[PDB]
Amino acid sequence: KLPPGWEKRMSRSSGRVYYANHITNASQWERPSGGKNGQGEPARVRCSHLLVKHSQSRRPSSWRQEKITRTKEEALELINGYIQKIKSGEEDFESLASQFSDCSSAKARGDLGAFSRGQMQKPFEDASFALRTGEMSGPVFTDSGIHIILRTE
Hints:
CATH topology of the largest domain: Chitinase A, domain 3
Name: Peptidyl-prolyl cis-trans isomerase NIMA-interacting 1
Largest sheet: 4 strands, antiparallel
Entry title: Crystal structure of a mutant PIN1 PEPTIDYL-PROLYL CIS-TRANS ISOMERASE
Distance between the termini: 24 Å
PDB class: isomerase
Keywords: Nucleus, Phosphoprotein, Rotamase
Assembly: monomeric
């Protein structure tokens, strides 16, 4: 059972029986979905994302700040913060993307439109294609920085 990338695991804290995905870095208590060996994988998907860059990003510069100086570690803590606010409903994805994304797509609520296999950096692509419409990833790492991907179509 269990769709691509999903492994059962056991978290400290308690009898955290939970589910995690090694492609998307998503985690959750709930079992992923249903008896249909596949579903396949669309030729195309549509995703938004929120990018936080750091000093080791291939371009330490964004519309939000000319010289980015945060460390990969600091950026990772920020992603975790936003993921917390998002998962709790305090703030929504589009809102934090518009405000804090270091991608120019910030001004599109983070929307990147539809794409295929081949077009995006591979971990982003692998994660986007492992998500299902509606699902959000954990922190995803690329040469740009650290992403949160929301799959919209």
